Enzyme design. Structure first.
Site, short mmCIF file in Angstrom:
data_model
loop_
_atom_site.label_atom_id
_atom_site.label_comp_id
_atom_site.label_asym_id
_atom_site.label_seq_id
_atom_site.Cartn_x
_atom_site.Cartn_y
_atom_site.Cartn_z
NE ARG A 4 -3.45 -0.54 2.89
CZ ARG A 4 -4.62 -0.04 2.47
NH1 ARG A 4 -5.24 -0.56 1.41
NH2 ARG A 4 -5.16 0.99 3.09
CG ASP B 282 -6.08 10.29 9.58
OD1 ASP B 282 -6.72 10.99 8.78
OD2 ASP B 282 -6.54 9.23 10.04
CE1 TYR C 110 -4.48 5.71 12.66
CE2 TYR C 110 -6.45 7.08 12.82
CZ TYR C 110 -5.32 6.69 12.13
OH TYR C 110 -4.99 7.28 10.91
N1 LIG Z 1 -5.06 4.40 3.80
C1 LIG Z 1 -5.70 5.50 4.18
O1 LIG Z 1 -6.81 5.84 3.79
C2 LIG Z 1 -4.98 6.40 5.22
C3 LIG Z 1 -5.69 7.52 5.76
C4 LIG Z 1 -5.12 8.41 6.72
C5 LIG Z 1 -3.82 8.16 7.16
N2 LIG Z 1 -3.09 7.04 6.63
C6 LIG Z 1 -1.75 6.79 7.12
O2 LIG Z 1 -0.82 6.58 6.05
C7 LIG Z 1 0.15 5.56 6.44
C8 LIG Z 1 0.06 4.42 5.44
O3 LIG Z 1 -1.31 3.99 5.32
P1 LIG Z 1 -1.67 2.49 4.86
O4 LIG Z 1 -3.12 2.35 4.62
O5 LIG Z 1 -0.79 2.12 3.74
O6 LIG Z 1 -1.29 1.58 6.12
P2 LIG Z 1 -1.60 0.04 6.51
O7 LIG Z 1 -1.68 -0.68 5.26
O8 LIG Z 1 -2.77 0.02 7.39
O9 LIG Z 1 -0.33 -0.40 7.35
C9 LIG Z 1 0.99 -0.05 7.03
C10 LIG Z 1 1.98 -1.06 7.64
O10 LIG Z 1 2.18 -0.74 8.99
C11 LIG Z 1 2.70 -1.91 9.64
N3 LIG Z 1 2.39 -2.06 11.05
C12 LIG Z 1 1.21 -2.00 11.70
N4 LIG Z 1 1.39 -2.23 13.04
C13 LIG Z 1 2.70 -2.42 13.17
C14 LIG Z 1 3.42 -2.70 14.34
N5 LIG Z 1 2.86 -2.81 15.54
N6 LIG Z 1 4.79 -2.88 14.23
C15 LIG Z 1 5.42 -2.77 13.03
N7 LIG Z 1 4.73 -2.49 11.91
C16 LIG Z 1 3.34 -2.32 11.96
C17 LIG Z 1 2.19 -3.10 8.82
O11 LIG Z 1 3.29 -3.92 8.35
P3 LIG Z 1 3.23 -5.54 8.03
O12 LIG Z 1 2.22 -5.66 6.96
O13 LIG Z 1 4.62 -5.82 7.45
O14 LIG Z 1 2.93 -6.23 9.31
C18 LIG Z 1 1.41 -2.48 7.65
O15 LIG Z 1 1.75 -3.11 6.41
C19 LIG Z 1 -0.23 5.14 7.89
O16 LIG Z 1 0.56 5.89 8.87
C20 LIG Z 1 -1.70 5.56 7.99
O17 LIG Z 1 -2.14 5.82 9.35
C21 LIG Z 1 -3.65 6.14 5.66
C1 LIG Z 2 -10.93 3.86 6.67
C2 LIG Z 2 -10.58 5.30 7.19
O1 LIG Z 2 -11.75 6.19 6.97
C3 LIG Z 2 -9.26 5.86 6.54
O2 LIG Z 2 -9.16 5.48 5.11
C4 LIG Z 2 -8.01 5.40 7.25
N1 LIG Z 2 -7.43 4.26 6.89
C5 LIG Z 2 -6.22 3.76 7.49
C6 LIG Z 2 -5.51 4.53 8.52
N2 LIG Z 2 -4.37 4.07 9.07
C7 LIG Z 2 -3.90 2.87 8.67
N3 LIG Z 2 -2.70 2.47 9.31
N4 LIG Z 2 -4.47 2.06 7.73
C8 LIG Z 2 -5.61 2.49 7.14
O3 LIG Z 2 -6.19 1.71 6.21
N5 LIG Z 2 -6.01 5.82 8.97
C9 LIG Z 2 -7.38 6.26 8.42
#
Ligand SMILES: NC(=O)c1ccc[n+]([C@@H]2O[C@H](COP(=O)([O-])OP(=O)(O)OC[C@H]3O[C@@H](n4cnc5c(N)ncnc54)[C@H](OP(=O)(O)O)[C@@H]3O)[C@@H](O)[C@H]2O)c1
Ligand SMILES: C[C@H](O)[C@H](O)C1=Nc2c(nc(N)[nH]c2=O)NC1
Ligand SMILES: NC(=O)c1ccc[n+]([C@@H]2O[C@H](COP(=O)([O-])OP(=O)(O)OC[C@H]3O[C@@H](n4cnc5c(N)ncnc54)[C@H](OP(=O)(O)O)[C@@H]3O)[C@@H](O)[C@H]2O)c1
Ligand SMILES: NC(=O)c1ccc[n+]([C@@H]2O[C@H](COP(=O)([O-])OP(=O)(O)OC[C@H]3O[C@@H](n4cnc5c(N)ncnc54)[C@H](OP(=O)(O)O)[C@@H]3O)[C@@H](O)[C@H]2O)c1
Ligand SMILES: NC(=O)c1ccc[n+]([C@@H]2O[C@H](COP(=O)([O-])OP(=O)(O)OC[C@H]3O[C@@H](n4cnc5c(N)ncnc54)[C@H](OP(=O)(O)O)[C@@H]3O)[C@@H](O)[C@H]2O)c1
Ligand SMILES: C[C@H](O)[C@H](O)C1=Nc2c(nc(N)[nH]c2=O)NC1
Ligand SMILES: C[C@H](O)[C@H](O)C1=Nc2c(nc(N)[nH]c2=O)NC1
Ligand SMILES: C[C@H](O)[C@H](O)C1=Nc2c(nc(N)[nH]c2=O)NC1
Lengths: 266, 256, 257, 268
Positions: free
Chosen positions: A13, A159, A172
């Protein structure tokens, strides 16, 4: 003259897209992973096939708990070892991207579950980033000025929507708030070492679709720009720009990449 | 496709750097100016010598007053700036609201007090509003099949206005209005895929607080600010809208 | 006996603020633009409770000149503050509550209507507050230190939801943004005169279905739920508070679409 | 008679908050960690003014397990709230005021594990994690109360910090914990709104500034505050906390109110 980037939770991702974007700019990348070993090693093979010795992988639980070795290993030590891995293999660490993050409910309303959730959510989202930044900084300070890189940059993945809390995700949301505080405090304290610290806050990106299609589409349609979640690249390209030398006067700031979602109200 | 950018107050300093950075990316640029005719025309000659027909200049007072031709309103002068781009190149993809007056309006010690109001609010807030409105109308009036694929509006705000400069109330208020315009326009124009963001310098190209900037202990160069503007206009920033990016070296993190 | 000047005091929130300040002991100058009958009825009510505790003054706070040379907005604002000094010899509190609120769409979806909207929306919400604060401050500065009141307070009525813009209300949203900037700039510059300047930002209040979207109680607020906050900020217990905007929105700014 | 639980209530701002709430008619549970003598003196004073209007309860709110199996922070927090129900049968107000505050430099110059490990647990526990568990316990007690027996003015106040967005050099963990506490304020306000439990924050700038330093240095620090050129008194902060707990502030939730004399408006 090959810079090095350490990216946490790099297997897939956004983290994978960030690691790929930094690699495309010429960086050698250390891909950290926790449970996604297979995906991380596949990513490393791909990058190493494009440019020999341009990627390695390191495993670590960034939860705020002690692991088994002698004595128990603390989170700080595991974080110091991630940064050390970059110096041991390539002799430098120019960029750190705190991307790894656990995300799941911790409802206020109706033992090991609460204990571990707290340590896991706060550890990955805030405490590990703190220890990683501390180790990263110690390495730079301990490097003779003449041998220091010329473009140090730390990016914390925050975020864009936490100020409009997602119902039931208090720990979170608290951890992300702590991460914004770390971004400002470290930017101010590390400024003398010319280490920039900024945040990138996605809104909805590659949205988890484990729900009825109408509910997933309803959610995406709320983003004012394009009415969809973003792709991974739409977020990672911003991370790459902030690490570039053209962004060198930028520090202590969080950049929302949310398509205007934070501008909405119920 | 050669895109077009309209940059207000483009003759020198930051606006000149923004116009140069957009031009370096391939944009044809409309350089607006108020009194800096000689510098604006010199900039245009330079850009046109590098790439024929890639720059023009247009004059306009963006203060919120009527000028001599009935009287011409600020709205009309703004609509004409955007029209200049369509008339000469047939399009206007980027608008950078950079022009801005900046001077004291102390609350403690009515001709200059009213021209100050019209001038500070006009250049910093009202003209940007009318320019955005005209820019949007032109895009809405363009058949979908003929619209550009990367519309972007950048409002030059100020990273330090939440820690007000003593005695600059109207200016500080106008920048606050410009932040509100950034958010409101981003929301309303999102359907037309027109992004609207802000870039807020701290201290840039100073001509004494320099040493208080946490990063590097100096004001920024013009490029350190304009490169950010250029990145927000690029397609790589297409999911970003309604946001203000500080380019202040951590100055807003300080306290007295 | 302290004096409060409240703009747009004839009804709804302004009326409630005038009533709340009056209940605390303030003599109140009720400003109105078109609501003469409601303003005068409010004044009759307050004066019946306590003789010579209210007056009314009319003024268009739009940023345009009016006929008596032409009278400027600054002059009309200075006269509102002067009305308080002329009648009671003081002006301790200023509440910038008066405000026009209507659409100014960016997308089409007569021509001078824009000219008046701009002058009206920006004038009532931002420019008049600026001139009123400036006149209020000059009168305090011109008062010998020994004779100054001990609790000067200016309250700007802002909007808790403007950072999540209402679609189609750009000029109004911009004007409230300018009003927040005035709140901080004036707080800083007037601090030496111990004049505090803060903002109170309602979410949805006394609405003439959105209401049900407010987290707390699932309704818009009553006028008092907002005015009691204004009254508290003007009280001496709030004397270390300045340059800050307090949301009174029931958690509405915490929501997302 | 409503009940308020105030953490770190033995002195300074917490004492003033407990005194202010008591003056409004609240019975107050004074929590303390190391200030037993101060806490008991405060309770004696309040009880002498109004019998059975105060009790004291001890608890380390650091995020560590204590000796009784080991007692967890969540359990110690649940017991603080329970003390109010056991003694008075209710808990209407919760003020998360307790807080550790000291440096955690990123650089040394730019035994050991013990100070770090304990600093993290202490700074984050008092400033963010305990508030979370206290709010969770407070909320569970209200949800578990039949609607017909519920109080009519539930209010939670988190003591935040007006200056954390202009970080104090070298205080990263503390700054991070206050950031987490602001997040808790908003998230709990939203989630507890259905139970009419309001959650807001009050953020002092400089208050009753510790003066363990040269007089010229202490005067220089307070002189930076735009309004009055001094740190605030304890009451200048506590009166704001009392107002937010009053029924007149019942439409206010999820918001943080700065009580800083304009300090956050300054720049270097
Ligand atoms: N996706 C969204 O809509 C969204 C929205 C707002 C903010 N964000 C932020 O953007 C960043 C990337 O988002 P994402 O959706 O790509 O994240 P994600 O897929 O939910 O997770 C990213 C990686 O974090 C690792 N992780 C979780 N807990 C861990 C732990 N305790 N120790 C070590 N590694 C850990 C996992 O690694 P493994 O798979 O290798 O275990 C996972 O692959 C995050 O900081 C997230 O909060 C994302
Ligand atoms: C689902 C939610 O509304 C939003 O897309 C977020 N997704 C994620 C998040 N953080 C992590 N680590 N992974 C997610 O998929 N912060 C907010
Ligand atoms: N420089 C800094 O440290 C700093 C800090 C924070 C924010 N900013 C913002 O960044 C942007 C650029 O800053 P800058 O220092 O480069 O600006 P600047 O030099 O002060 O002025 C930019 C141009 O604005 C034009 N202008 C002023 N009033 C006008 C009016 N009434 N009508 C039409 N044009 C008018 C002038 O054009 P003519 O010369 O052609 O008359 C001037 O050259 C501005 O929006 C500014 O507020 C700058
Ligand atoms: N109600 C809400 O939900 C809400 C939400 C967010 C913010 N607010 C803010 O809270 C304040 C009070 O709200 P409200 O609903 O009570 O306001 P309102 O009823 O819309 O208007 C208040 C008064 O403002 C006066 N006014 C308007 N234009 C004027 C002008 N050009 N010159 C002089 N006076 C003018 C009017 O006086 P006359 O009647 O005498 O002409 C009107 O009675 C306003 O600042 C508003 O923006 C309200
Ligand atoms: N004073 C200021 O200028 C200022 C500025 C900004 C924000 N604030 C905030 O306002 C609130 C009150 O400030 P203050 O100066 O009055 O605070 P303080 O005196 O520094 O401390 C308040 C109490 O917190 C308790 N405490 C600390 N660590 C604890 C732990 N691990 N477990 C349990 N209790 C613990 C202590 O209780 P015992 O004495 O009983 O051990 C202490 O008396 C705090 O949240 C503070 O962060 C104060
Ligand atoms: C000098 C001041 O502290 C700061 O550098 C600013 N300069 C300027 C400004 N705005 C304009 N238009 N021009 C400036 O030189 N906003 C703030
Ligand atoms: C209706 C809208 O969502 C909100 O209640 C607002 N109302 C008003 C406002 N401003 C004024 N002057 N009057 C209102 O009724 N600002 C926002
Ligand atoms: C000294 C500093 O500038 C400021 O007055 C603060 N003091 C304190 C604080 N937090 C606590 N717990 N105690 C304090 O004395 N946060 C910030």
């Amino acid at each position: 003259t090959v810079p090095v980037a350490l990216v946490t939770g790099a297997a897939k991702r956004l983290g994978r897209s960030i690691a790929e974007g930094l690699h495309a700019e010429g960086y050698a990348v250390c891909l950290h992973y926790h449970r996604s070993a297979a995906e991380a090693n596949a990513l490393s093979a791909t990058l190493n096939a494009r440019r020999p010795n341009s990627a390695i992988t390191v495993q670590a639980d960034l939860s705020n708990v002690a692991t088994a070795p002698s004595a128990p290993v603390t989170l700080f030590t595991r974080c110091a070892e991630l940064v050390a891995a970059c110096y041991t293999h390539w002799g430098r660490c120019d960029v750190l991207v705190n991307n790894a993050s656990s995300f799941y409910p911790t409802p206020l309303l109706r033992r090991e579950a609460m204990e571990t959730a707290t340590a896991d959510l706060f550890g990955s989202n805030a405490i590990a980033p703190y220890f990683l930044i501390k180790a990263f900084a110690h390495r730079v300070a301990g490097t003779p000025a003449k041998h220091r890189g010329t473009n140090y940059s730390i990016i914390n993945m925050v975020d864009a929507m936490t100020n409009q809390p997602l119902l039931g995700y208090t720990i979170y949301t608290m951890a992300k708030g702590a991460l914004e505080g770390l971004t400002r405090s470290a930017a101010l304290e590390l400024a003398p070492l010319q280490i920039r610290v900024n945040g990138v806050g996605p809104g909805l990106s590659v949205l988890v679709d484990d729900m009825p299609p109408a509910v997933w589409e309803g959610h995406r349609s709320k983003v004012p720009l394009y009415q969809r979640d973003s792709s991974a690249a739409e977020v990672s390209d911003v991370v790459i720009f902030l690490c570039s030398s053209k962004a060198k006067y930028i520090t202590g700031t969080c950049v929302k990449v949310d398509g205007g979602y934070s501008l909405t109200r119920a």
